[PDB]
Structure formats: structure tokens, C-alpha cells
Design a protein around this ligand. Structure first.
Ligand SMILES: *[C@@H]1O[C@H](CO)[C@@H](O[C@@H]2O[C@H](CO)[C@@H](O[C@@H]3O[C@H](CO)[C@@H](O)[C@H](O[C@H]4O[C@H](CO)[C@@H](O)[C@H](O)[C@@H]4O)[C@@H]3O)[C@H](O)[C@H]2NC(C)=O)[C@H](O)[C@H]1NC(C)=O
Ligand SMILES: *[C@@H]1O[C@H](CO)[C@@H](O[C@@H]2O[C@H](CO)[C@@H](O[C@@H]3O[C@H](CO)[C@@H](O)[C@H](O[C@H]4O[C@H](CO)[C@@H](O)[C@H](O)[C@@H]4O)[C@@H]3O)[C@H](O)[C@H]2NC(C)=O)[C@H](O)[C@H]1NC(C)=O
Ligand SMILES: *[C@@H]1O[C@H](CO)[C@@H](O[C@@H]2O[C@H](CO)[C@@H](O)[C@H](O)[C@H]2NC(C)=O)[C@H](O)[C@H]1NC(C)=O
Ligand SMILES: *[C@@H]1O[C@H](CO)[C@@H](O[C@@H]2O[C@H](CO)[C@@H](O)[C@H](O)[C@H]2NC(C)=O)[C@H](O)[C@H]1NC(C)=O
Ligand SMILES: *[C@@H]1O[C@H](CO)[C@@H](O)[C@H](O)[C@H]1NC(C)=O
Ligand SMILES: *[C@@H]1O[C@H](CO)[C@@H](O)[C@H](O)[C@H]1NC(C)=O
Ligand SMILES: *[C@@H]1O[C@H](CO)[C@@H](O)[C@H](O)[C@H]1NC(C)=O
Ligand SMILES: *[C@@H]1O[C@H](CO)[C@@H](O)[C@H](O)[C@H]1NC(C)=O
Ligand SMILES: *[C@@H]1O[C@H](CO)[C@@H](O)[C@H](O)[C@H]1NC(C)=O
Ligand SMILES: *[C@@H]1O[C@H](CO)[C@@H](O)[C@H](O)[C@H]1NC(C)=O
Ligand SMILES: [Ca+2]
Ligand SMILES: [Ca+2]
Ligand SMILES: [Ca+2]
Ligand SMILES: [Ca+2]
Ligand SMILES: [Cu+2]
Ligand SMILES: [Cu+2]
Lengths: 740, 740
């Protein structure tokens, strides 16, 4: 009864360097040092910086153009850094995208504006619409709040003044209102959560404050009004007189309590203290990894891992049976578009790459976020002249699905194939949201992209919000919002020259050669190719009647059928409900359809830019401008896919939303691509022949007949070795003294 | 290092008798004996019977009316048998639904026609449209085939004559054509599969034969024509002259080979011979079962299992936290509606309860169809005066999902809850189809109903079928078909008096009290109740914008919000594409919408009847007739749900369709039903607090801290104990001599 051998993944070396992953620590250090030695940039370190300096917002690898990468992979691009500067030594503060290279840093190294990969052509510059993060509080919000401190005490026994005794918090909208040169704020009071709980987004208080914060001089900012209980007041005097008048309606606060906390609560059900089932890996990891080149192979699949600050995880050069199917697959942006009868919730339209997925891709809880036997990679990100490493933030694992891949029974025999699949997973927790992203690979050739949501909802005050959600607590509205997450799928099916084919199942009344002048009500296939970008923005059909295929017309199979891959919403999807959003303007045009196809260009690498929110009337990347009538008939196309959900939170979203139901996914599956089903090549299948009450034969096809043992420790033990974020200072470069 | 204790499920006793499950062996024996002792019925045993006798098609428990069951459960119905007779001692053969009772069988026992639970009111009688199964071959098809034996030899080196040397097979349509009193057949030649392979449905040959088979006298049947390569011939002479003419196009057969077989084939991928991950249950089964009353409890859930010949598995009295949410949940019928440029495939519209799900609910392969630690129940069915028991054909198991239930991270702590859920599963294999049905229960209160499909597709000959599928092999078309499977969901939310509410997310341009004469492009909730059956047949909205809730308006929560359950297509769904199908006529009106709500009646227990196919112009149950303008405002309603798929098989459906992508599901989740998320009551969650590079606290909430060991045997060992179908003769009743 020998122990099972839980062997780690195989150590292999990727055939090519990983030209996408990111900067090495040294490179990032060299570039930082170089940038500070450029007096024209006149940069200050974060530690020394305040609100009126020039600082380094980001230093990362500039990803090479596909036209550079493909000849390196198929037949080594010079590395360059992408740098972002926050220039606040000015009354017109701005963000600046630049290129620093060539690397390694040398006398030959230069910098220049970067405007190639953006649709806005402004030398990589966009305004910084929130340059006074501190001053907006100390010289404005807190002063205004002190104007009504007596009122906030009477309403909720609280104050927000900027002191230790503060029991209230003030914040509002994203993006800020950007009508006609002006920059306008709508803010709300919130109750604070108890110490060591993250429940503030469940504690709105319902008093709103409109501010014109145009310019960086607080003596020129104006108080445009207040709102409470659906009544508007132009001035503070008018609100104060109304408040203390007899008959004034005072509404209750939301106060923190067990209801808003994630701890165990309520009756423990029968037998739940016993161990639930646990997935184990008797032979360990049945895949191969290059840890240095962040490269993975599993069965017939291989791919490279990439990771940035904006969108976190990304996959490159995804191949199947030695042949590329996707040059690039990755998150592009996440939208959280709200609506409400109040101005704060009405105005929220989060574009998460502003905050970044990479910085909040924290370490996973082993055994919970992924199975215990999963292999775990690191990810890092640059901020504040520091490299932050999130230890064990990616996970990789095989998983035996609760249902088999295939089967067939008869009166004489039964056969079944197991469904063993591979998953690459990341989880980013941006403030209150927990997005869990998963990339699946299956033995039938199916690639899956999924997202699930959990964490805290961004709540809304109950008062008069009947048309925009449910009341789910004493003074709480669940509110409403659309999640829309855009993914870039650069399919290069049997080469770059591809076409989108729509294969539709549609009703027809039809006559036939055997019908005899009679007709029959039946159905038919309707086939058409998307010819141009003019007709390339579409939605999933009524009754799922239209299938969408990415094919290569120049590589048909032996039956004249173009080889390709079907894209289907396996777990359901949804695009933005709001038409011509007032919040977004031009900032998220990708959110308007489920499936969008454009011709590939190296000057259109991403569907978004992190600071689209800074200038919604003229964003760096305006996705709309990608559509200029280019041909999509056997050219290099990119399929842009939205995963998404319509979320009207109910009482079951308290304390947190659950991953079971907050779910959205698409799947890429072979379509007339192979001679047959490739899952049949697995040994992990069986055929039992049977008669007269017993099995006569059991064919197991060369799979393991191993008998072995495992000792199961409680996974919670490993939780004690949770460390979190490992910081290394990069200027001055001090890699031997990490800290937290 | 003590071994893990894999304890079986707890033995409990259900609070009430299981009034739905089925007849006991003795009852079934007593009823058979009784029926044969009724000379008015003049019945012959199957062993003695041919085509011109009266036989017993079915003996089963007549399920009691809900009006009888509810007072027994909430405050014991007399048992009656439902019997079906195949009366073929007549030139107008017919099926007869009757009631035999009361039970136990005594002098008081009687029989009578049963027409209460059918919409057709014809004393439970419907014609038998296929009474001459044997004669249709020996006196017709084989004689006609011998007429062209020389041609079938030249075309495919084969013959169908009714001999041992037969290499071809002949069969065709379901239902048979039923225009204007006549009964018409369209049949096709098929190639036979090799010995011990089930691949015939992949081997069409493309020669078609139209026959008028009206009446039971073969000398009055007529040969209406032939079809081949899209050319029609009215007579055999005309076809024979055309065939042997110079220039006649002869098209190739589909012949069996590895391509059509399910055995392992192709390159075994890297590391696949190693053991894949395996789910184990360290503490065994964390649920409770009454084996005698077929009753299950898991955590906060409980339900009764029922099982019949027509639709197989069914659930009754599904309760949550001691309160009923569904009186009944179960498969009602499965449609397989095809289309093609040929008459056989054009005419196929299978209604599977004719064949029955219960007879083909074969024993599962342990470790493959379900996890190895699953508990396995039996199911049985009556046929041919015999009780057939399918050993270990139901399975029950917990499963730790590959993703957690909920999580939330901060810079100071992380918390996660596991997603451990319960599954009840059955698999029916009707001829070539393998339907795997699964009922899921989750710790958030979510109930899931799923189907996946695998097995062999019913193929189509390639010739001239371009508009109705792909060519996927040398002479093979994948064809096309809609799967539509109807489920009855009798929600009784906090009592029988319920209402359907549609909560929709829709765009609006809106003015506000804080807007200042400006409007904003936003979105809003749109709420409406379904008032009547006139407006109760609907489809899932555009962009998933409309949520469907089953609520009780008379039991609102403390915030005025009606308590209920959301129904959502979690895994995607689809209804029948074909409008006013010529194949179906009135036989499957439930297939026409995704979601259909009717008022509950005991005289409408099922949406279908097995022999709807026998009289498509006047079926026993015509679902359309359920809709007669009855109020659905706070009355007892039934939600009828379709799971389904549009399936245009491609090359990856060879040899079999795969469960990964052939998938469809709905989910019932609490909606403003509880004060909060009930998943938080589980101990199987964790919270890690962390700082300065280490975890300061790990709260595990009273879950298992067990360290134990398991020996893992290869599951294939248990496969040798596969026995299959255990038959016991019920007339003469001989329970001590079972056989196969
Ligand atoms: C190289 O970088 C340095 C900074 O790293 C930069 O010096 C900074 O210049 C900014 C102005 O661009 C200074 O900010 C001002 O400081 C003064 C005095 O302390 C304040 O009074 C100013 O605020 C008032 O006036 C503003 C309008 O002019 C209003 O908008 C504002 O609300 C106030 O009323 C303003 O904050 C900053 O202090 C210096 N820092 C240092 C260390 O000198 C320098 O100019 C750059 N070099 C070049 C060549 O550009
Ligand atoms: C009680 O049940 C028994 C059967 O269990 C029943 O006797 C059966 O009657 C049927 C007729 O209803 C008989 O079937 C016929 O048999 C004759 C002679 O063998 C055949 O020639 C007949 O077939 C020809 O004629 C038919 C039209 O009349 C044509 O449709 C057909 O194509 C043929 O040309 C026909 O098959 C059957 O043989 C008997 N069986 C026995 C054992 O007697 C009996 O009538 C029932 N009792 C009562 C009171 O109803
Ligand atoms: C769209 O792309 C396809 C490329 O396959 C073009 O069709 C091919 O055209 C060549 C001649 O240039 C033929 O020899 C091939 O047989 C064609 N293949 C198929 C499958 O049709 C097509 O012409 C292009 N459309 C336009 C408008 O240029
Ligand atoms: C539809 O059903 C609801 C049952 O709740 C009816 O509304 C209730 O009517 C009673 C009076 O009969 C009131 O006292 C309740 O307050 C009502 N409740 C709600 C939530 O409105 C309603 O009248 C019925 N509709 C019709 C047309 O009869
Ligand atoms: C905080 O202290 C200030 C100054 O004394 C006071 O005005 C305010 O009421 C205090 N806040 C609270 C919540 O008591
Ligand atoms: C992740 O980073 C930590 C801290 O730098 C390091 O100790 C560890 O080796 C890294 N993980 C791997 C797999 O190399
Ligand atoms: C969107 O709305 C704005 C103002 O509401 C209007 O000026 C503009 O024309 C609209 N855009 C479109 C594309 O309809
Ligand atoms: C079967 O035997 C018959 C009678 O001899 C003959 O006509 C026919 O050709 C045989 N079938 C085949 C497939 O050879
Ligand atoms: C299933 O039926 C078989 C054959 O009658 C019997 O031996 C076995 O005990 C049954 N299973 C259970 C769990 O009782
Ligand atoms: C369905 O079609 C038949 C014949 O094609 C026709 O007689 C009938 O009116 C149609 N029914 C409906 C509801 O349109
Ligand atoms: Ca373009
Ligand atoms: Ca491409
Ligand atoms: Ca009715
Ligand atoms: Ca009901
Ligand atoms: Cu949400
Ligand atoms: Cu199918």
C-alpha cells in the first residue's frame, strides 16, 4: 500500500523567449534610475512627492507588435518599456504615455511620446481629472461637512471632519461629470464599517452634495447643491433651514452589523462539520511548465502567460496539436454601470483598468480558491518605485469534472470517457468586487473563458429608489448594475487569413422533389459570411438560433467545409443595457454589443485605455473608431467578446454576492476542424461488456491500474503561511531587503 | 495516520409514506394476476402473444392527485394502479388507459376507463398506429427490397431480405405520416454495424421508399414511390429502368469503421497514462436516506424520489429549511425534431416517452458516470409481465465545486466559503441518445436542473443535403435537429397561492429632482405581474434583460417585497425552431416557448402523453388546451420549462457527441426570500488575517481539522461487478428465480 506520488509539473524549456510577460526586476530598476536622470522629465519620487510634482505612474514592458512577434515565433523583438507619467507640476495636469528603449538600458536608450496604439492622437497625453485627491477633502468636502456637522450628528450620530473621531466617510462618482469644460462631483455620506470588516459599500446614508471642482484653485470651486429624500436644495442655507423646520422627514442610517459581515452565521446544518469531498491528484501534475518563461503545456495544448497592471492575466500563442488557434486571449476592460434615483449611484460607471486588475491580484487561499494540489505561480506589478509581488496569485490545475466527457450504453456493453480538464485562474479584488477569472482547456479541444463575481455590492440608499432596485435591508437598496467585461480573442485559425461565418437554424415552409406539390413546415441552415466591419457588430440571436464561427475559407477539409472554431456563450452573457450612456459618453463603446469583429492592426492592441475615464468626450482609445469599413473576408481578424451580467442585488447578496449565480462565460470549440472528436485519444476511458448477470470484459485502454495511498492534512494548515504582498524597492534598487 | 472513515449515508425514516414512487413488486404481481382473470379484457401473455392479441403494455402506480397528497403531507391516499392495454384483437387496434383499484387487490377491486388526466376525452383510448411491426417487414418491406436486391447489391454490396446473411437494414420515420385517415411510411436503407458496435445511426445509404400502410391487410398497401439523389420515381419499374440506364449516378455507401466506434483512437497525449485527479469523500456521505421510502435529506434540503416508465426520474415535496418550494419537479417529454432534404430525416420528430426513459435508465459505470463514493439507488420498470430492475441506476453525491461559493479579500484579511453541493443523477440511453439528467442543490439555496447529451447522432445521407447540415464523412451528413426537453416545476412558494413577476432591466432617458431640467440616458427596473394564462407563454428576453420570478404576493418580507424564487437559464436553453411543424401537428405544443405558466389542476398532471405520436391530429394530451384564460394572480400555478439545444452535428460529433458542449440547464434561486445569503451558515469557510509577511489568525469556524488516510483502488475493479438488468417474472409471480 505505497503512498501516491504527487509529482510536481514537468520542467520544460519553452521553444521561444516569452516576449510578452513583462519586465525583469533589473530592467524595471534600470528604467526607473534612467527616468530620474532625465532632467527634462523633472520627476520626483513618490516618497518625496505630493500633489504638485511629476511622478512615475507605471513602468512596464511595452508588448511587441504582432508583426514582430509572429516571425520570431514562426521563423527576438527588441524590448522597450512603456512608461506612464503623472505630471502634476502644472495647472493643467496630465498623464503621459511614453516609450523607453531600446533595452537593456544603455547610452543608446531614448524616450519618446507613444501614440501608435491609441486612437486619440495627442502624443500619448490625456488630462488628469483628479489631481487634487487630498485638497478636495481638506479644503472642500470636510469644510462643507463641518458646515452641517450638527445635522450629520442629528441624522446618524456621526461626523466627517478629517479627524481620528470620524465615524462617517464621503465619496461619490466615477467618472466625474465632464460637461462643457467643467468638472463636476456628486458625493454622498457613508457610514464606516467596524474595525477589520470591509462592509462600507453596504452603508450609504443618503445625503448628496454637488460640487463644481473645475481647476486646481479651491477658492474658485462652487457648491452646486444638496439632495436628500428626493428634494433638491441649491444652497447650504436652504438645506439647513429646511432640515430644522418642523415636519422635516429624517430617514434612518444603515449601521454595520453581523448582517454585513462574511463570518459564519445562522444554524449549522446537519452533518456539515464532517469533511466535504476533496479533489486530490494521486499522480500529481500531468502538465509541463517553464517557470522562467511562464510557459505551459497540457496534453495537446500550450500557451504563454502574460501579466500587466491594467488587465492582469493574458494568454499568448495558444496552440492546439502543434498549431496556433489564438495569438492572444485576454481581459481588456471591466464595466460596472449603475443606475438609481440618486445622483451618485446614477452616475457610477466604473472602468476597472483605471484602478488596475494586476495590483489587486492578491495571493489565493490554497484549497479554497483552487484545489490544494494546484501549482501556483507568482505575479508582480510596479507602483511607487517598487515591485510588488503577489505570491501564489495564479493557479494551475487539472480537475476531473463531475460529469463524464462522453458515453454510450447498449443491452450488451457500456462505454464512458472521463472529462479531465485544465484550468488557469486569477482573482482580482478591486475594492469591493471579487472577480474570479478562469481559462479552461478540455480534451475535446474546447477552450473556455469564464468570470464569476462575489464580494460586496456597491449599495444604494433606500429612499425613493423604488424604480432602480429592491429594498434589501432596514435602509438599504440593492441597487442595479451591468457587469460587462471585454475580452480580446485574436483567432488565427490555420493562419492569420480568416472569415467569420454565421450558421443559423431558421424556419421554412419548403417544397421537395419527393413532396408532390405539397409543402412542409420544417427548418433549414442559413449561411452567410461577414464581409466587412460595417456589419461586424452583432448580438447573440433569438432562441440561440445563430451560431458564430471563426473559419479559414482557404483551408477547407476534404468535404469542402471551411475549418474553424465555434464561439458560443456557454454560461450566458450580456452587454450594456444603457443606450448612449450619459455616464460613459465615448469611454466604453465596446460594451454596446455581445460580439464585435475588427481587422487586426498593431495600432489597435487594446479595446480600452485606463484613463478613458479622464476624458470621456475624447478618450485615448475610442473603440467606435475601429470600425471603418475594412474587409473581414479572409484577412486577419480579431473577435472582441463581452462576458457580462445584469445584476439587481437582492437580500441573498447580503453580506456578499455568490459565485454560483454571478457567472458568465464563452467557449471556443472546434467546428469541422478535425476528422473527428479528439477526446477519443485519451486512455482515461473504459468499456464494459456484459451478459448473464456479470461483466465478461473490462477494457481500460492503458490507463493507470495503480493502487496507492494519500495522507489528507487539513488545508487550513497551509493558510498560516499566507504572507501576501512582497515589496522590493526599485529606486534606489534594493532587491536584498524585501518587506511588507 | 488513521484511515478516513467513509461512512455511508445516515439511515432515517421519512415523515410520510412515499405516495408517488411506484408499485411494490407484490402489488404489480397481484394486479397482473387480476387483469388476466378479467375475461372482458380477454388478455394474452406476451410469451403467447403475437400481433393480433390483447396484451398489457404497462402496469404502474397511478400517482395520487395533489388535492389528496397535500392534506396527507401537511395534516394516506388510497393506492390505485394505472394500466395500459395494447388491444390488437381487432382491425382498429388501440391503446387503453384504465384505473385498477383500490389496492391492495381484493374483492372490492375494480377497473374503469381513465380520461381524467388527459385533454382528449375518449375513455382513455387512442389508436395504435403501428400494430403490425413484424408483418410490415415480412409481407411488405423485405418483399419490396427483394424487388431491388440486384440494385442494393450493385450499390452497396448488400441485401435486406430477412435472412441471416442480411448486411442492410430498413427503417424510417417517427411519427408516421397521418394525413386524412391514411397512415404513410417513408423508409430508408441503412448499413449494419460490425458485431458488438452500436454505430448504425451513422450509416445511412440514401434510398427511400414511400408506402401507404393504411389498415392491417398488406394486400391493400401501396408503394407510393422511391427517392434517390433528389430524384423521385412513382413506381419500382421506373426506378429499375433508370438505375440500369447508362449515365445513372451511383453514390457511395457509409461503411462502418474505427471512425464510427467509441474505442480509444489516435495519439495518446503527454502524461495521460498517469492518474488524473480523483474526487474522494474522507468522511463519506454527509446526507440522509430512507431507502424503503426513497427519501433524501441534505443539509437544509429534502425531497422524495419517484420513477416511472414514461419519464424516468421525478422529485416530489422538495422542501428548503422545513418549507416546501416545489410540490413536483420532473421530466415531462423529450423532443428530437429533425430536418433535411430527404423525407426520412425531414419527417423525424421523436417524442421519447413513447419508448420511455425508465426502461433505458441502465446501471451507471461507477467512478465515471458519477464519483466512486456516490451512493447508488435502484430503479425498476414493468414490461412483458416482468419487473426489470436496473441496479445502481440512480446516483447521489456531494461534490466540491472547482470554484468557491463566495470570497472577499482586503489588504489585511481574506475570507472564502467552499462550494459543496448535492447531486441526484440518472442517465437514460434510448437507442442512440444518451441523456444525462442531474438535479443540483447548493448551499445558497439554488436548485439546478440540467441535461447533457452524448451517444450517437442520427445521421443523414450526404447527397443533396447541403441546406440541412454539414458533410462530416465520406458519404455522411451530420444533419440537424432541435432537442427540447420539457420539465414540470410546480412551485408552491410559501403555499400554493403564487404569482409570476417579470422584473426587467430596460433603458430610459429620465429627468430627476437633482437633474435641473437635464435628462440622463440610464436604465430602470420594469415590473409587471402575469395576470392570466392569455399572457403566460413567453421566451427569455433580448440580452437577458427580463428576470422571471415565482413569488407569493400575500407573503412579502418586512420591506414590502414579495418573497419568491428566480428562474434563470444558467446553462442556456432553446425551444423548437420549426413553426407549426408538419411532423408534430398538435403532438408537442409545449415545445413552442421557453417558459409557460398554467394554473394547476389535478386533471393536468403531465404536459404530454406517450402515444401523442399515434394520433398527432387528436393527441391524448394537447398542451395548447391548458390555456383557457384562467387567472394566475395568487393562485396555484405550474411553471413548465424547456431545456434544449440546436444541434447541427459536425465532425467532432464522430464517433459520439460530447457532454461538454451538448448542455442545457435552468436554475431556481431564492429571490428576496431570506433575510440574507444562507451559504454563510456553513462551517466550511475560512478567514485569514495577515500582516508583516505572515498570517496572524486563521479562523476555520468549527470545520473538520482531521488528518486521515485513504487507499485509492482503481475504480475499474468495481466495473467487473456490472450485472445490468435483473428480471423477475410477475405473472406467474416468481420472485425467487431472477435472471437475465
Ligand atoms: C520640476 O518639478 C517641480 C516639482 O517636483 C516643480 O516645482 C513645483 O511647481 C509647482 C507649480 O507647478 C508648485 O506648486 C505650487 O506651489 C506654490 C508655492 O508652494 C503654491 O502656492 C501653488 O498653489 C497655489 O497656486 C496655484 C496656481 O498657481 C493654485 O492652483 C493652488 O490652488 C494654490 O492657490 C502651487 O501648489 C510646487 O510647489 C513646486 N515644487 C517645488 C519643490 O518647487 C518645478 O516647477 C519643475 N520644474 C520645471 C522647470 O518645470
Ligand atoms: C380474445 O382474444 C383473442 C386473441 O388473443 C381473439 O382471437 C383473435 O382474433 C383475431 C381477430 O381479431 C385473430 O386474428 C385473425 O386471425 C385470422 C385467422 O388466423 C387471420 O386470417 C386474420 O388476418 C386476416 O384478416 C384480417 C382482417 O380480418 C386482415 O387484416 C389480415 O391482414 C389477414 O388478411 C387475423 O389475423 C386471431 O387469430 C385470434 N386469435 C385466436 C387465438 O383466436 C378473440 O377474438 C378475442 N375474443 C373476443 C370475444 O373478442
Ligand atoms: C472572399 O474570400 C475568398 C477566399 O477564399 C474568395 O473566394 C476564393 O476565391 C478564389 C479566387 O480568388 C477561388 O479560386 C476560390 O475557390 C474561392 N474560394 C471560395 C471558398 O469561394 C472570395 O472571392 C473573396 N471575396 C471577395 C469579394 O473577394
Ligand atoms: C392579485 O392578487 C393580490 C393578492 O395579494 C391582490 O392584491 C391584494 O388585495 C388585497 C385586497 O383583496 C389587499 O388588501 C392587499 O394589500 C393586496 N396586496 C397587494 C400586494 O397588492 C390583487 O387585488 C389581485 N388582483 C385582482 C385583479 O384581483
Ligand atoms: C469629533 O470632535 C469634534 C471636535 O471636538 C466634534 O465637533 C465632533 O462632534 C466629534 N465627532 C463625533 C462623532 O463625536
Ligand atoms: C514568488 O516570490 C517569492 C518572493 O519573492 C519567492 O520567494 C518565491 O520563490 C516565488 N515563487 C516561485 C514559484 O518562484
Ligand atoms: C447621445 O446623447 C447626447 C445628449 O443626450 C446627444 O447629444 C447625442 O446626439 C447622442 N448620441 C447618439 C449617438 O445618439
Ligand atoms: C443472401 O442469400 C440470398 C439467397 O441465396 C441471396 O440472394 C443474397 O444475395 C444473399 N445476400 C448477400 C448479401 O450476399
Ligand atoms: C438492487 O436490486 C438488486 C437485485 O434485486 C438487489 O440485490 C440490491 O439489493 C438492490 N439495491 C439496493 C441498494 O437495495
Ligand atoms: C399549420 O399548417 C397547416 C397546413 O400547413 C394549416 O392548415 C394550419 O392552418 C396551420 N396552423 C396554424 C396555427 O397556422
Ligand atoms: Ca478597422
Ligand atoms: Ca486573427
Ligand atoms: Ca388553464
Ligand atoms: Ca404551484
Ligand atoms: Cu454585481
Ligand atoms: Cu443532438
Amino acid at each position: 500500500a505505497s503512498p501516491c506520488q504527487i509529482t510536481p509539473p514537468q520542467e520544460i524549456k519553452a521553444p521561444k523567449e516569452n516576449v510578452w510577460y513583462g519586465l525583469t526586476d533589473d530592467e524595471t530598476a534600470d528604467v526607473a534610475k534612467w527616468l530620474f536622470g532625465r532632467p527634462e522629465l523633472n520627476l520626483t519620487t513618490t516618497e518625496n512627492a505630493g500633489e504638485w510634482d511629476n511622478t512615475i505612474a507605471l513602468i512596464e514592458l511595452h508588448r511587441p507588435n504582432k508583426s514582430e512577434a509572429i516571425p520570431y515565433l514562426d521563423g527576438a523583438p527588441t524590448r522597450h518599456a512603456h512608461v506612464r507619467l503623472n505630471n502634476r507640476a502644472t495647472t493643467d495636469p496630465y498623464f503621459a504615455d511614453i516609450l523607453v528603449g531600446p533595452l537593456p538600458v544603455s547610452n543608446a536608450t531614448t524616450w519618446e511620446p507613444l501614440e501608435f496604439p491609441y486612437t486619440r492622437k495627442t502624443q500619448g497625453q490625456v488630462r488628469n481629472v483628479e489631481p487634487d485627491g487630498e485638497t478636495v477633502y481638506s479644503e472642500w468636502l470636510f469644510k462643507i461637512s463641518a458646515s452641517i456637522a450638527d445635522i450629520t450628528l442629528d441624522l446618524w450620530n456621526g461626523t466627517a471632519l478629517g479627524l481620528e473621531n470620524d465615524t462617517l466617510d464621503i465619496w461619490g462618482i466615477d467618472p466625474l461629470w465632464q460637461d462643457d469644460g467643467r468638472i463636476i462631483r456628486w458625493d454622498m455620506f457613508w457610514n464606516m464599517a467596524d474595525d477589520e470588516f470591509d462592509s462600507e459599500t453596504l452603508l450609504p446614508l443618503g445625503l448628496y452634495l454637488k460640487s463644481d471642482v473645475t481647476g486646481r484653485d479651491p477658492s474658485q470651486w462652487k457648491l452646486l447643491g444638496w439632495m436628500y429624500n428626493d428634494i433638491f436644495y441649491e444652497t447650504t442655507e436652504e438645506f439647513r433651514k429646511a432640515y430644522w423646520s418642523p415636519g422635516f422627514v429624517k430617514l434612518k442610517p444603515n449601521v454595520d452589523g453581523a448582517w454585513a459581515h462574511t463570518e459564519q452565521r445562522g444554524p449549522v446544518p446537519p452533518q456539515d462539520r464532517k469533511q466535504p469531498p476533496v479533489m486530490i491528484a494521486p499522480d500529481g501534475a500531468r502538465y509541463s511548465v517553464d517557470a522562467e518563461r511562464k510557459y505551459v503545456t497540457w496534453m495537446d495544448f500550450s500557451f504563454y502567460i502574460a501579466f500587466n497592471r491594467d488587465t492582469g492575466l493574458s494568454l499568448f500563442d495558444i496552440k492546439y496539436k502543434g498549431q496556433r488557434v489564438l495569438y492572444e486571449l485576454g481581459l481588456q476592460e471591466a464595466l460596472a454601470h449603475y443606475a438609481a434615483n440618486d445622483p451618485v449611484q446614477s452616475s457610477v460607471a466604473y472602468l476597472d483598468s483605471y484602478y488596475g486588475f494586476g495590483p489587486y491580484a492578491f495571493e489565493l487561499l490554497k484549497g479554497y480558491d483552487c484545489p490544494s494540489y494546484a501549482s501556483y505561480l507568482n505575479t508582480s506589478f510596479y507602483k511607487d518605485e517598487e515591485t510588488h509581488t503577489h505570491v501564489d496569485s495564479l493557479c494551475l490545475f487539472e480537475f476531473d469534472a463531475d460529469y463524464p466527457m462522453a458515453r454510450h450504453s447498449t443491452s450488451e456493453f457500456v462505454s464512458v470517457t472521463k472529462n479531465v480538464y485544465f484550468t488557469l485562474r486569477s482573482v482580482s479584488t478591486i475594492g469591493n468586487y471579487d472577480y474570479m477569472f478562469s481559462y479552461n482547456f478540455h480534451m475535446d479541444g474546447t477552450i473556455g473563458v469564464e468570470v464569476r463575481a462575489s464580494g460586496y455590492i456597491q449599495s444604494a440608499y433606500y429612499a425613493n429608489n423604488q424604480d432602480f432596485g429592491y429594498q434589501i435591508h432596514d435602509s438599504l437598496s440593492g441597487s442595479m448594475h451591468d457587469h460587462v467585461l471585454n475580452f480580446k480573442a485574436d483567432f488565427d485559425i490555420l493562419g492569420p487569413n480568416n472569415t467569420i461565418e454565421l450558421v443559423s437554424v431558421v424556419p421554412v415552409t419548403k417544397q421537395f422533389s419527393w413532396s408532390g406539390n405539397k409543402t412542409r413546415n420544417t427548418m433549414q441552415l442559413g449561411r452567410s459570411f461577414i464581409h466587412s466591419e460595417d456589419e461586424a457588430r452583432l448580438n447573440w440571436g433569438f432562441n440561440g438560433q445563430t451560431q458564430l464561427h471563426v473559419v479559414n475559407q482557404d483551408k477547407p477539409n476534404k468535404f469542402g467545409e471551411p475549418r474553424g472554431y465555434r464561439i458560443l456563450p456557454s454560461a450566458g452573457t450580456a452587454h450594456l443595457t444603457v443606450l448612449n450612456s450619459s455616464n460613459l459618453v465615448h469611454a466604453a463603446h465596446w460594451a454596446e454589443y455581445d460580439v464585435q469583429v475588427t481587422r487586426q492592426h498593431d495600432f489597435e492592441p487594446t479595446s480600452a485605455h485606463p484613463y478613458n475615464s479622464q476624458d470621456i468626450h475624447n478618450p485615448p482609445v475610442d473603440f467606435s473608431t475601429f470600425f471603418n469599413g475594412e474587409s473581414l473576408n479572409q484577412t486577419d481578424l480579431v473577435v472582441w467578446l463581452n462576458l457580462g451580467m445584469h445584476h439587481v442585488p437582492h437580500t441573498g447578496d447580503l453580506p456578499n454576492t455568490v459565485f454560483t449565480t454571478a457567472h458568465s462565460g464563452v467557449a471556443f470549440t472546434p467546428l469541422n476542424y478535425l476528422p473527428g472528436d479528439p477526446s477519443r485519444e485519451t486512455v482515461n476511458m473504459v468499456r464494459v461488456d456484459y451478459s448473464d448477470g456479470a461483466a465478461t470484459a473490462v477494457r481500460t485502454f492503458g490507463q493507470s491500474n495503480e493502487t496507492c495511498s494519500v495522507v489528507l492534512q487539513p488545508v487550513e494548515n497551509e493558510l498560516w503561511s499566507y504572507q501576501g504582498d512582497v515589496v522590493v524597492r526599485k529606486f534606489p534598487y534594493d532587491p536584498n531587503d524585501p518587506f511588507y
